[PDB]
Design an enzyme around this catalytic site. Structure first.
Site, short mmCIF file in Angstrom:
data_model
loop_
_atom_site.label_atom_id
_atom_site.label_comp_id
_atom_site.label_asym_id
_atom_site.label_seq_id
_atom_site.Cartn_x
_atom_site.Cartn_y
_atom_site.Cartn_z
N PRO A 18 -13.12 -25.28 -37.44
CA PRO A 18 -14.89 -25.31 -37.32
C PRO A 18 -15.31 -24.49 -36.33
O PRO A 18 -14.71 -24.39 -35.34
CB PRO A 18 -15.21 -26.76 -37.61
N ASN A 19 -16.40 -23.70 -36.66
CA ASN A 19 -17.04 -22.97 -35.58
C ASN A 19 -16.73 -21.81 -34.90
O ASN A 19 -17.44 -21.00 -34.36
CB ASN A 19 -17.50 -23.95 -34.43
N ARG A 26 -22.55 -16.28 -30.41
CA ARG A 26 -23.25 -16.97 -29.52
C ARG A 26 -22.47 -17.12 -28.30
O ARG A 26 -23.39 -17.09 -27.15
CB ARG A 26 -23.27 -18.39 -30.11
N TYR A 31 -15.22 -14.51 -22.94
CA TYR A 31 -14.32 -13.31 -23.45
C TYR A 31 -14.91 -12.30 -23.33
O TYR A 31 -14.33 -11.22 -24.09
CB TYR A 31 -13.11 -13.89 -24.43
N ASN A 85 -5.33 -23.51 -35.38
CA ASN A 85 -6.76 -24.20 -34.38
C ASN A 85 -7.65 -25.01 -35.15
O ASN A 85 -8.58 -24.52 -35.66
CB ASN A 85 -7.17 -22.97 -33.47
N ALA A 88 -12.42 -28.74 -33.10
CA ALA A 88 -12.91 -29.98 -32.98
C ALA A 88 -12.54 -31.20 -33.60
O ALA A 88 -12.36 -32.38 -33.41
CB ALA A 88 -14.53 -30.08 -33.07
N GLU A 109 -0.07 -25.63 -32.46
CA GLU A 109 -1.47 -25.45 -32.29
C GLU A 109 -1.89 -24.80 -31.16
O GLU A 109 -1.14 -24.71 -30.03
CB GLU A 109 -1.95 -27.21 -31.91
N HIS A 111 -5.38 -23.86 -28.90
CA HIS A 111 -7.06 -23.98 -28.42
C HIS A 111 -7.33 -22.87 -27.39
O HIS A 111 -6.65 -22.62 -26.50
CB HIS A 111 -7.14 -25.25 -27.64
N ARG A 118 -12.04 -30.81 -20.08
CA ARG A 118 -13.33 -30.85 -20.33
C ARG A 118 -13.72 -32.31 -20.75
O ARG A 118 -13.44 -33.11 -19.82
CB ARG A 118 -13.49 -29.87 -21.67
#
Ligand SMILES: O=c1c2ccccc2oc2ccc(S(=O)(=O)N=c3[nH]nn[nH]3)cc12
Ligand SMILES: O=c1c2ccccc2oc2ccc(S(=O)(=O)N=c3[nH]nn[nH]3)cc12
Lengths: 168, 168
Positions: A18-19, A26, A31, A85, A88, A109, A111, A118
């Protein structure tokens, strides 16, 4: 005997959660406005620059169920490994983690961010625990690292299985 | 002007933490008796095969304080980046994590095993949170992935700094 030429079309499926489709619209100023399509192009260029016999398929979704469907569609069909990936969903989706567990193939996996650095709720990865290996905090570069690893893994699995494993 | 030939001796320091020196003597049957020296040779071969202008220095210790001393000795002196596996100290050593935080250079964390997939006490990495990025679960291959990333990072930092950054 000697009737099956070698060697590899490796087929690798890249699943983005997602996202991630909003990269470079946004953020990331992190990067410099790299988009998700651009990451995919980067991966394709990695393959080309290495003269590798690899086919990539790309898939992005904001749906947990679409990720599980896609993993399942790979089990019976052609894809030798998955780079994923889950974003969330990594911290919450036992269902995706279970789908990975029983995918019957290598799953790596990735990220963008170092999720260990975080909020406390981002440190857990159910999905990461199910995957063979996890890469985090290298931005787009992490995906090329995942590709480097997957090519090594899939090339060695063949050597074993065939020639060695068996010459029908 | 034009009096400083290019380009790179990249100098990378590889720091290995506790128990890793016993690889291939007790385990890993997990990688078929690969030793720590063999991992270091693998990294050197990666450099050679890529015709890269990279100098590696290797250091292993079972002492938290020796890891901190080594990180500090790099701050003032020549090493452009660090690849570190703090092993079991990753979960407990705030002091090593703080040393990384203020090392003033890129630091990449590597683990052989997928520490996210094991005992609850192994999931936390203080040191991983301090590092730019973390790689886990690829066995020796993880170290070559760390090297691939570090070379990219250090090559891009130069481009920026010099030529661009400045032509004295
Ligand atoms: O950095 C982003 C990002 C930036 C702009 C717009 C959308 C974005 O979506 C993202 C999705 C995932 C990630 S991620 O760092 O790759 N994975 C995460 N897992 N939990 N949190 N983050 C980074 C990101
Ligand atoms: O797999 C090993 C290992 C096998 C035989 C003998 C000594 C060994 O030492 C190790 C030290 C560290 C790691 S490690 O998986 O790279 N890092 C860890 N952090 N927390 N737990 N593990 C693996 C290992």
């Amino acid at each position: 005997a000697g009737l099956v030429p070698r060697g590899s079309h490796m087929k690798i499926l890249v699943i983005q959660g997602p996202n991630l489709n909003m990269l470079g619209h946004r953020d990331p100023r992190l990067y410099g406005m790299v988009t998700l399509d651009q990451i995919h192009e980067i991966m394709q260029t990695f393959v080309k620059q290495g003269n590798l016999d690899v086919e990539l398929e790309f898939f992005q979704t904001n749906f947990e169920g679409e990720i599980i469907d896609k993993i399942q569609e790979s089990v019976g069909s052609e894809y030798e490994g998955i780079i994923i990936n889950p974003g969330a969903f990594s911290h919450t989706s036992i269902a995706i983690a279970d789908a990975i567990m029983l995918a019957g193939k290598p799953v790596i996996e990735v990220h963008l961010t170092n999720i260990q650095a975080r909020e406390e709720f981002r440190k857990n990865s159910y999905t990461g625990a199910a995957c063979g290996g996890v890469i985090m905090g290298f931005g787009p570069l992490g995906y090329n690292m995942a590709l480097m690893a997957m090519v090594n893994i899939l090339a060695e699995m063949k050597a074993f299985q065939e020639a060695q494993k068996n010459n029908p």
